Amino acid sequence: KEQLYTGLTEKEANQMQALLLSNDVNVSKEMDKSGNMTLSVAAADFVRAITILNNNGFPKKKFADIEVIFPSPSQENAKINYLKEQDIERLLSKIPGVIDCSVSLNVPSSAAVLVISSPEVNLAPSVIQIKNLVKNSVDDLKLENISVVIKSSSGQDG
Amino acid sequence: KEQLYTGLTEKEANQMQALLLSNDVNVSKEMDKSGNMTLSVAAADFVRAITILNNNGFPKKKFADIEVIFPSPSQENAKINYLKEQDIERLLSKIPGVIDCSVSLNVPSSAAVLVISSPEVNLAPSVIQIKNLVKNSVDDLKLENISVVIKSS
Amino acid sequence: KEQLYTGLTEKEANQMQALLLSNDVNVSKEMDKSGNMTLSVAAADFVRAITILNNNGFPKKKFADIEVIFPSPSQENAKINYLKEQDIERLLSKIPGVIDCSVSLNVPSSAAVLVISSPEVNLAPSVIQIKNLVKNSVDDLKLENISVVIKSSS
């Protein structure tokens, strides 16, 4: 057996494990004393496993945390903006069929909104509603300056 | 057996191991007492292994960390810009098929965006969506001043 | 055996070792207690070994560190510029086939960019893309004031 990763959360390990199993890769999981997970595979499947994980963006990379960068007027305003982004994500994530959401705000304001849907749901009829919710959440934002992109978790082709 | 490299992250060791194995170099991996990965090969494969790794830029070089250069107005704005770059990378990294992303922002603003896609996903038709997402994330940025380049891993 | 260099990193030692071996030089390596490497060669190969290493830029020189020179608006602007150079090197280094990159910025701005490619990848068709990425990363930079030079490690 070849080790893939240790120290995985339950969710990360489950997603990677399910992905590999669905591609007929023999993967085994073990839990350490902290409750974190280790995935391993047969040596003969190692290259195939890494290709599959790589192509699917696993393990997921981390990005800068505002609370680490800023643990001042401009600093305060970045924290206020971040709170608003999080509030809008929280709200949009209650729409049935939404499974992930990112909002980046520029406060004439503008906003970028990425919504990931269940593969079995088409959120296109909700785009006008989403834009109106974002518009009215945020100071001085017009419809023409909100970009909404919707994607199925199953990929670019739906 | 001959140790090639120690102190590797799990991800980098896996990339290096898979690369070697796919070029028919037998390689073994182990974890040391600090939790870092070591890769080893047979002495007879040493030169080939290093040639392969060198040609693929492994082990990967590191670059300056903003938090080290700056552990002040200009310093503050650099950190605000970095946060925005990271926010945009985080958002773009949720697009199906994106496996790596870099954003460098100049705030008339401009922006440079490199997207690495899965070799199995064609992201070229998404360039305008990606451009529009970046445009609306950042103060005073026009489409004509955003470069989006997509490369397959 | 004659000593070449001690205190080498794993990468520097591996690269020098592989280079020498590929040129039919009998080189041996030993690890010290700190994990650093020593390379040695037979005395009869010493001159040739030093020639080959010198010709390939080994061992790599240390150049002035901005954090040492500047441990002021001029000093602040140098560090901002350095951060941007590093950001651009980090970005360009994700392009498949890039194995090394240097960026020197003059902020009309100008920029100098050197990219070292793998011997097995032709990055010449990517020069315009690289130029455009650099252009839009940096305040007040036009295409005609960006030099991009690509060299194969071969």
Place this chain on the structure above:
Amino acid sequence: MKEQLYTGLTEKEANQMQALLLSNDVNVSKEMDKSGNMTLSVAAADFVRAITILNNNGFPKKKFADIEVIFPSPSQENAKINYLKEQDIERLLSKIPGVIDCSVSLNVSSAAVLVISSPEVNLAPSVIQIKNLVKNSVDDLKLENISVVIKSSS
């Protein structure tokens, strides 16, 4: 009988001196002392020949003033900024395959650039590239005011 030539040498310089002597048909032995520095010795009968060869090649190498010692102010600041730029450009140029060593002296407007090249590489076709990289690294520099001189180590 053996006779010491020099102690306190860096590994790089002892290697240069050892290779020079061997290639000029003088045997040499090397050791590392307790402080990590290198000592070169010869058979006593070879002492005059050895010192002659070393003297004729300028070894051991003279040292030059260190900006961080002369300046341990705006004129001082600008010298340090210039030095950083010179070092950045040397670092960049030193990545070009075939470059053994290089020096850059900037007047910020004009620049002087010396490159020492491998005898196995022809860098003459790269002079225009080198000039353009230097030009675009540095404020208000024109091609006509950049001198690039390339010399083989041979």
